[PDB]
Amino acid sequence: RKLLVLLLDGFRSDYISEDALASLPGFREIVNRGVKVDYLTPDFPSLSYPNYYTLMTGRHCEVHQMIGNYMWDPRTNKSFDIGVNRDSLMPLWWNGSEPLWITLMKARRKVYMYYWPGCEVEILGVRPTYCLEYKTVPTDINFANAVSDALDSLKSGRADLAAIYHERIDVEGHHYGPSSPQRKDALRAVDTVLKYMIQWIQDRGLQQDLNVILFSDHGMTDIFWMDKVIELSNYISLDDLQQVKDRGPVVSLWPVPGKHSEIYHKLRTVEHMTVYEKESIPNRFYYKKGKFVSPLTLVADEGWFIAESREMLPFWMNSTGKREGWQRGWHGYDNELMDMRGIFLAIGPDFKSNFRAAPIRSVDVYNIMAHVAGITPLPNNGSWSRVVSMLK
Ligand SMILES: *[C@@H]1O[C@H](CO[C@H]2O[C@@H](C)[C@@H](O)[C@@H](O)[C@@H]2O)[C@@H](O[C@@H]2O[C@H](CO)[C@@H](O)[C@H](O)[C@H]2NC(C)=O)[C@H](O)[C@H]1NC(C)=O
Ligand SMILES: *[C@@H]1O[C@H](CO)[C@@H](O[C@@H]2O[C@H](CO)[C@@H](O)[C@H](O)[C@H]2NC(C)=O)[C@H](O)[C@H]1NC(C)=O
Ligand SMILES: *[C@@H]1O[C@H](CO)[C@@H](O[C@@H]2O[C@H](CO)[C@@H](O)[C@H](O)[C@H]2NC(C)=O)[C@H](O)[C@H]1NC(C)=O
Ligand SMILES: C[N+](C)(C)CCOP(=O)(O)O
Ligand SMILES: [Zn+2]
Ligand SMILES: [Zn+2]
């Protein structure tokens, strides 16, 4: 039957703990009438673009190839800069595996996507039926309207799958911290939309024709500027680097020829991070085989933040003029950290009700989505055994 998928960026698993659900009527109703996993473990790195593609392919990042929010290809000398630069639209970055919406389009199913990062790309020669492109952070009004519009498109048969992306829980987790009232306010707004979404589904006659799946790409943890900042320019010269990508927990480095060993050994001494040669990256990350993975990768300890320098931190615009706001939450760290856990819930004719499911991994979600959408999944890294018991 029809499928509505909701991606809630940055939604940490314990945001809907038992204690939290006592004041979250929308999620409480989904929990009471559907499926909730204890938590969703993301892929490494626990960043957006990697986990977006893990969720929609069922494959680890070393397979689908989207291994960072920021990536560089030495062959073409082109960059993927968290989807902003025009070259992010190159199928080079996206053709490493076929995501579910492309498979559905090629099976002549109709797909509507709202603000979903990636829907604006021609992937493997294909695009979804409809894409409302992500431009800025969507507002809570944008979210409520997309949910209503998606239900209309599913009811009218213009869409078989509708997929909606919402960012603001991530933004407030970053700007104010995961335990902040600002983050809780953004969650409350989503909870209220979901409460009425349930009413809209019933009221428009879709309750028996529609499953709804909700998940997140990763959780969120506290960071501690300026004490817990690692300034790379205190240890190595940028002149010894061909390229550097990203700041924060996971940083990709490409040394100039002849400086690989020196950069490696110099950064090996730095406390509160780990530097890995590509061949020595922990196998459990299912990351090291990706073609875009850099010769050296830095992984910060939880709560620490790697940057070129303090003055080069990603300050945010909390005021009119220059960006001076400190970030208070972040993610990207070791994907087995409790704070990096995300969520998965489901409700509808094909899911059990009031069912607490064991924790699953980001790679497990694709098989579920494909099953209830009625399409054969492409071979992937999900475990059917880890998810099968939530289905009716
Ligand atoms: C915009 O932010 C600056 C920087 O201060 C950061 O301090 C943290 C509390 C963090 O939450 C982050 O949001 C915030 O941006 C604010 O200036 C700072 O104000 C504090 C007291 O609130 C002073 O102790 C600091 O000395 C001062 N630092 C600087 C560089 O000004 C600023 O108030 C804020 N602007 C607005 C309009 O709120
Ligand atoms: C997916 O995108 C890649 C990147 O554009 C395509 O491969 C490139 O294009 C041609 C294919 O032979 C070559 O000249 C390039 O060297 C390729 N670059 C690579 C492979 O990194 C690929 O063909 C696309 N696949 C589909 C099905 O459209
Ligand atoms: C994750 O799944 C992918 C896709 O099924 C696996 O990659 C395939 O592995 C077989 C066996 O070596 C190859 O014949 C295919 O060509 C591979 N496909 C791709 C797209 O790479 C991969 O081995 C799985 N990873 C793990 C850790 O189980
Ligand atoms: C990629 N994005 C800009 C749409 C969302 C935020 O990215 P991320 O901080 O969750 O990795
Ligand atoms: Zn995210
Ligand atoms: Zn984020």
Residue numbers in the entry: 24 to 415
From the paper:
Here, we showed that GPC is hydrolyzed to phosphocholine by ENPP6, which is present on the extracellular surface of certain cells such as oligodendrocytes and liver sinusoid endothelial cells.
Accordingly, we also determined the crystal structure of ENPP6 in complex with phosphocholine, a reaction product, at 1.8 Å resolution. Tyr72, Tyr75 and Tyr188 provide π-cation interactions with the positively-charged choline moiety. Furthermore, Asp32 and Glu190 electrostatically interact with the choline moiety. Tyr72 forms a water-mediated hydrogen bond with Glu143, while Tyr75/Tyr188 and Tyr157 form direct hydrogen bonds with Asp32 and Glu190, respectively, thereby stabilizing the conformation of the choline-binding pocket. The conformation of the “insertion loop” is stabilized by a disulfide linkage between Cys142 and Cys154. The Y72A, Y75A, Y188A and E190A mutants exhibited the remarkably reduced α-GPC-hydrolyzing activities, as compared with the wild-type and C393A/C412S mutant proteins, confirming the importance of Tyr72, Tyr75, Tyr188 and Glu190 for choline recognition. The crystal structure of the ENPP6–phosphocholine complex showed that ENPP6 recognizes the choline moiety of phosphocholine, which strongly supports the idea that ENPP6 recognizes the choline moiety of its substrates, such as GPC and LPC, and hydrolyzes them to produce phosphocholine in a similar manner.
